[PDB]
Amino acid sequence: LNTYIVPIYPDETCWVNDFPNARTEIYTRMYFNHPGYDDYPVVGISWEQ
Amino acid sequence: WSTEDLRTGRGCFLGNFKPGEGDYTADGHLIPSRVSSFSPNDFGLYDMAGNVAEWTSTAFSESGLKQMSDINPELEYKAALTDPYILKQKVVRGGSWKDVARFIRSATRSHEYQNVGRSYIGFRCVRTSIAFSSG
Amino acid sequence: MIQVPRGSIVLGNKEADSLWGIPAESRPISVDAFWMDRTEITNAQYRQF
Amino acid sequence: ELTGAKLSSWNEPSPFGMIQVPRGSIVLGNKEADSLWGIPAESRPISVDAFWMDRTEITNAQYRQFVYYVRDSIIRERLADPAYGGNEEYKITENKFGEPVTPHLDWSKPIPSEKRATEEEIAAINSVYYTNPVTHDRKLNPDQMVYRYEVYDYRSAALREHQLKAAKRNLNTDIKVDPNAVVMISKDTAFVDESGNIISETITRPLSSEYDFLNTYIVPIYPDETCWVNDFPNARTEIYTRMYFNHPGYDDYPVVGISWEQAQAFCAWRSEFFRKGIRLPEGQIMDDFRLPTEAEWEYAARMGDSNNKYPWSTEDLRTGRGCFLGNFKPGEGDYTADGHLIPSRVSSFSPNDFGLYDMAGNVAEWTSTAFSESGLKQMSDINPELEYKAALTDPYILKQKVVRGGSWKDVARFIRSATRSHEYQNVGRSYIGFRCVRTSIAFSSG
Amino acid sequence: TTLSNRAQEFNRRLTQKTDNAPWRRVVYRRVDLMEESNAVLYYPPRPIGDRKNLFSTIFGLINSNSLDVYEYLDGFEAFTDQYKIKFQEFLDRFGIYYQPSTNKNAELFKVADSDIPSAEVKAYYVKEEWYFTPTNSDVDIKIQAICPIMTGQDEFGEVRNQPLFWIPYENIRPYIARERVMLSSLNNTRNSTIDDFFRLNLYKGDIVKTENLHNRALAEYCPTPDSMKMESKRIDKELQGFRDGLFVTQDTTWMKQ
Amino acid sequence: TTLSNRAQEFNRRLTQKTDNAPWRRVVYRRVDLMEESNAVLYYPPRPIGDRKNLFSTIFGLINSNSLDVYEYLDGFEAFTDQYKIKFQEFLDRFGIYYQPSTNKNAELFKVADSDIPSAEVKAYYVKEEWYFTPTNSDVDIKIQAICPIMTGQDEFGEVRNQPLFWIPYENIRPYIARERVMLSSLNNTRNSTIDDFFRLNLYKGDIVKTENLHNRALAEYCPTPDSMKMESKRIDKELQGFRDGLFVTQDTTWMKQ
C-alpha cells in the first residue's frame, strides 16, 4: 500500500522566475484568476499535482 | 499533419510556435492560445503539437528505446527520497511555444525534473478501454 | 472523449541531422486501444477541483 | 463529470483620449553604420504585446489641474490644525452609522473665498502663497508643495530567493538549507521631522516579514521653469520663462522642464483619480499607468515594418510640395525653416498610420530603462525591460536614463527613430517632455 | 570602496549561466592588434597620465598581489592551485631589471617606466563558446580566458611568438569595468569601456583551434601560412549555416504552390 | 555509497538473461580508435582534471585492488582463479618506473603522471554475441569482454601489436556508469555515459574471428591485408541476411496474382 500528501495550488510564480529581465508580471496575477482566460491552457503544474 | 511543409496552402501557420528569430508573433499568438483555434488532425485530437508540452510517465535514460519490450512499452521507476537528484527526471514530449521549428518534430526528447514546474508544460489524461476484437 | 484504434508505428528517425550531433535511432512497436482527451486540461476543471 | 466551472466576467473600459496598438514584431537597430560618425553597427529583433497610448504629449492644462489638486489638499490640511484653529467639520472620523475608523479628509465642503472668509481663515489661506517685496507678485511657493505616494513592488516579491519560508528557497535535495538563512533587502522611506525638513534615507535590514517590499517617496512637484535661462548662455530667452507656464494662450502648447521623478509622480497620481470614480467589483484587476519602455516606443514609431527608417511613409525629409513634416531645425541656424522656433502647438503636422501624433520632433520623451552602451544585448526578446532603482549612496554615473526621439534642438541625424541619447534623472532641460501608456487586456481570438 | 546593496543585486541578474544547453561548441581565436579594428587595446604605446592600455593594467594588478594567473603548458589548460605562477620565475625568464621596493605591501618589486614591454605585445588569444539558451532559444557568446603573446629579436632574425600566461575572465571583470577608452580612429570621445568591447563581439581574427576528439591543433594538418588561412573560411560557414537553418522565416516554396 | 532499496530493484530488472535461445553466435571484432567514430574513448590523451578516458579509469581501479583481470594466453580464454594476474609481473614486462607508496592501503604503487601509456593505446577487442529472445522473438546484442592492445617502437621499425589483459563486463559495469563524455566532434555537451555507448552498438570495426569448429583464426586462411578485408563483407551479409529472412512483411507476389 502507498499513500502520499501533496499541495495542490498551482505554481503561479513561475512566469517571473523563468524569464529574467523581462516584463512578465502582467500574466502572473491574471492568468489563473481573470474570468476571460477560463478556456485558456493551464500552466505550472508539476508532475506530482 | 497531412503534408511535410510547415506552412499551409495560403500563407498561414498550422501551429502556435515561433517561426522566426524573435518573431514569436508570426504564428498569430504570443502566449499560449485558446484551444480549438487550429485545425485538427485525422483521428480527432486537437492542438497536438505546440501550445503547451505534455507530461509523460516514463523515466529518462539516453538508452531508453532499447530497454523496453515492444508490446505496450513502459519503463517505470518510483524514486526514493534518499537518492541523488539525477535519478528523478521524467520525459516531456511535444514542444511548446518556446521551441524552434526543430523541436516540434514528433520524435524529439526533452527532460524536466519532477519537482519543478515551468511556464510551458501542461498535461492531458488517457484511459484504458475495454472492447471486443471482432468489432 | 474520442477513440484510438489499434495498429503499429515506427519509432525514431533514420536520417540524423547533419548540423546537430544527435546520432540516429530506430525501433518498431505496437500498442493497444485507449481513449484520450480532446483538449488539454482547461482552467475551469482545475478550478473546480 | 468534470464539466468545469467558471467565474464572473468583467469588462475593460476604454479610457478617454486613447488609441490602440496591435501586436507584432520589429527589427531594432540599423545595419549600415554612418561613415562619418564613429558609431559601429548593432541589430537585434524583438516582439511586444498590446498596449494603449496617449495621442498627444501631456499638455499644460492637465499639469495645471494636478497642481491645483495638490494645492487644495494642502490647504484643507492647513485648515484643521491646532495653530490656525481646528474645525471638526472638515475632517471626519465618525461613521454615518456612528463608529470610529481611520481618519481622512473630506472633499465635500467648498473652500472659503479670499475676502469672504473669517480673519483666521484668511491667514490660513495665505500660508502657502509667496510674496516678493521688490516686484509685488504672488506665486505658489516652490518648496511647500510635496506629494507622497506609496507603491508596491510585485516583481521583486516573486523571485525564488525572496520567499519567506526556508523550505522553498532551493529545490535540490543534494544541497540542504540551514535554518539560519540571511538575505539582505533594501527599501525606501521618507521621514518628515519636527522642524519641517524632508529627509530621505535607504535602510538595509534582514528579510523577516513582508513590509520590506513597500516603498514610499516624497518629491516636489512644481515644474523647473528656470531651465530656459540656464540652458542657453548669452541669449535673450528671458521672454519665455515668465510666460511659458502662466499665460492662458499657451495652455495647449507642450510642457517643459519636468524631471524623471515628477514624471513618475504624475503617472502614479493618475491612477487614484481614475479609480476613485469607477467601480470594478469582480475579477477585473486593473493595471496602473506607467512610462513606456524602450521597446514599446520603438515599435510605436517604426510603424511596425522594418523598412521605414523614419516615422512617415517615404524616406525623404521634405514633402510633395516644399513643406517639412517635423518641427526640427533643417538648416544651420535656420531654426525657422520648419515653420516654428519654440515647441509648437500639438496637432499641427500630419499623423502617421496608426494614429499617433507629432511622433518625432517637438519635445523628446522619457523612458523607463537604464543607460549602458551594451543595452541591447542584455535584455531578453519578449517585452525587453531593464530596470534599476538607484540608491542615494551610489556615484553619480549610475543614474542615467535613456531619452529617445529628439526635439527641436536636434540636427537631421538625430531624428532617426533609432538613436540613443542620455540625460540624468535629477536635472530637467528645455527640450524634454513625456507621455503615458497603459497595459491592455484583450482576447487573442479577436 | 564597497558597492551598495542594490548594486550587488544588479550584478547577479546579468551574469550568464550555461548550466543546461543542448548545443555548445568551443573555438579559439587569434586577435591581431596591428589591424585598425583591434587597435583599441594598443592606444598608449607607453604609460601617459591615466590612460593605460590593457597589458599595462594587467601588470599593474599583479604587482599588488590582488590577482591570479596561471602558466601555459602546451596542449592542456586547467586552473588549479599547482599551476599558479610565482613572480620571481616569471620576471627572470623574460629579462627585466628589478629592485626591492621601499614599502613592504604597497609594491612587490620596483618596475621601470619603460622596461615593461607595452609596445611589443601584439596578439591576443581569446577562448569563447557558443551556446543555446534553453528558456529563450537564441544563440549567444561567452568569454572565458585571455592570454597575451609577445615578440622578440633573435640572432637568426626569427620572429618568435611566445605566450606569457592565462587569465580567468571573472577575476578581471571588476578592474576593467570603469576605465574608459575611445571606439574609433575618426571620433575620439571616451564613450565605452573595455568590458563592453568584448561583450559586443567587435574583434576580428583567424580561427586557430577547435575542440576535436583527436585533440590536434590546426597547424599540424596545415602545411603553409597560405594553406592555413583557407581552412578558416569553411569553419565560419558551419557556425553561420547553423543560425540560418534553425529558423524558418520565409521560403519561395509556399507562395507559388 | 550504498544504493537505495528501490535502486537495487531497477538493476535486476534490466539485466539481460540468455538462459534459453534457439540461435546464438559469437563474433570477435577489432575497434580502431583513430577513426572519428571510435574517437570517443581517446578524448584526453593525458590526465586533465576530472576528464578521464577509458584506459585511464581502468588503471585507476586496479591500483586500489577493487577489480579483477586475467592474462591473455593465445587461442583459449577462460576466467578462473589460476589465470589471475599479479601486479608485479605485469608492471615489469612493459617498462614503467614504480616506487613504494606512502599509504599502505590507499595506493599500491606510485605511478607517474605521464609514465602510464594513455596516448599509445589505439585498438580495442570487443567480444559479443547475437541471441534470439524466446519470449519476445527479436534479435539483440550483449557484450562480454574488452581487451586493450598497444603499440611500441622496435629496432627494425616493426609496428608491434600486443594485448595487455582481458576484462569481464560485469566487474566494470558499476565504475563506468556515471562518468560523462561527449558524443560528437561538432557538439560538445556531456550528455551520454560510456556505459550507454557500448549498449547502443555505435562502434565500427573489422571482424577478426568467429567460432568455427576447427578453431582457427581468420588470418591463418587470409594471405594479405588486402585479401583479409574482403572476407568481412560476406560475413556481414550472413548476419544481416538472417534478420530480413526471418520476417515476412511484404512481397510483390501477393499483390499481382
UniProtKB/TrEMBL annotation, chain A:
Q: Entire protein: which part is shown?
A: 247 to 295 of 491
Record protein name field: Por secretion system protein porK/gldK
Q: Give the species.
A: Porphyromonas gingivalis (strain ATCC 33277 / DSM 20709 / CIP 103683 / JCM 12257 / NCTC 11834 / 2561)
Task: Please indicate which superkingdom the organism of origin belongs to.
Answer: Bacteria
TrEMBL record, chain C:
Look up the coiled coil feature and give its residue ranges: none
Q: What is this protein called?
A: Por secretion system protein porK/gldK
Organism of origin:
Porphyromonas gingivalis (strain ATCC 33277 / DSM 20709 / CIP 103683 / JCM 12257 / NCTC 11834 / 2561)
Q: Fragment boundaries within the full protein? A: 51 to 99 of 491
UniProtKB/TrEMBL annotation, chains E, F:
Asked if the record carries the keyword Signal, the reply is yes
This protein's source sits in the domain of life called: Bacteria
Say yes or no: keyword Cytoplasm present.
no
Q: Which UniProt keywords apply?
A: Signal
Write down what this protein is called. Answer: Por secretion system protein porN/gldN
Native organism is Porphyromonas gingivalis (strain ATCC 33277 / DSM 20709 / CIP 103683 / JCM 12257 / NCTC 11834 / 2561)
The record's gene field reads porN
What range of the full-length protein does this chain span?
Answer: 46 to 302 of 359
